[PDB]
Amino acid sequence: AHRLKNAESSLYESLNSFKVANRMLITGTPLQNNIKELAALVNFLMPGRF
DNA sequence: GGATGTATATATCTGACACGTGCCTGGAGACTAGGAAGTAATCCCCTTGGCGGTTAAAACGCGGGGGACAGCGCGTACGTGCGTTTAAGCGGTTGCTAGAGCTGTCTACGACCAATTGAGCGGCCTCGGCACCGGGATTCTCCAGGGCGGC
């Protein structure tokens, strides 16, 4: 899921437009450079709560 | 008796219309100065229709041969197709820097104006050089005297 660490990358808008009820991310490094990567991951998971 | 083709209805996507707002740039109104329109005078170039004379260019004719074009052969180099490689295209990382945009301050540099004067334009006088006329030095053609031959 670290490949999904960028919100502006085309994979993010490709996977965020999918009509899926439940999502899950498997990764080894959740944070790599800053808090914004984790913010993008939790926005992909829960869009609005965090 | 079961499932398939087709018609009408409903929810969703998407381009377009109108509403709202800023802002800044164009428009309205007034004033002024100078750019350009108009006028008169002077002088030189251009127009149209002629004439005269020179002469070199243009036109015409003719012969001939050089060159353009057509045909043929040939061989090579480029097109075509297929299998393999490779690198373009896309998506992505990661930081730093260049640059556009905006705001702000200030200072040196260029516009502007008045007085001045010295470099540019025209004519006049003089010199350098080329040319016209007079005088001296040098060389070429010619007329006459002396000697020899013939009746």
From Swiss-Prot:
Disrupted gene: phenotype observed: Decreased sensitivity to the cytotoxic effects of 6-azauracil.
> Where does this polypeptide localize?
Nucleus
- Ranges in coiled-coil conformation: none
The entry sums up its family as follows: Belongs to the SNF2/RAD54 helicase family.
**Summary of subunit composition and partner proteins:** Component of the 1.8 MDa SAGA complex, which consists of at least of TRA1, CHD1, SPT7, TAF5, ADA3, SGF73, SPT20/ADA5, SPT8, TAF12, TAF6, HFI1/ADA1, UBP8, GCN5, ADA2, SPT3, SGF29, TAF10, TAF9, SGF11 and SUS1. TAF5, TAF6, TAF9, TAF19, TAF12 and ADA1 seem to be present in 2 copies. SAGA is built of 5 distinct domains with specialized functions. Domain I (containing TRA1) probably represents the activator interaction surface.
Q: Give the note.
A: Present with 1620 molecules/cell in log phase SD medium.
Record comment regarding domains: The 2 chromodomains are involved in the binding to the histone H3 methyllysine at position 4 (H3K4me3). The CHD1 helical C-terminal domain (CHCT) binds DNA and nucleosomes.
Protein role: ATP-dependent chromatin-remodeling factor which functions as substrate recognition component of the transcription regulatory histone acetylation (HAT) complexes SAGA and SLIK. It recognizes H3K4me. SAGA is involved in RNA polymerase II-dependent transcriptional regulation of approximately 10% of yeast genes. At the promoters, SAGA is required for recruitment of the basal transcription machinery.
Q: What is this protein called in UniProt?
A: Chromo domain-containing protein 1
Corresponding gene? CHD1
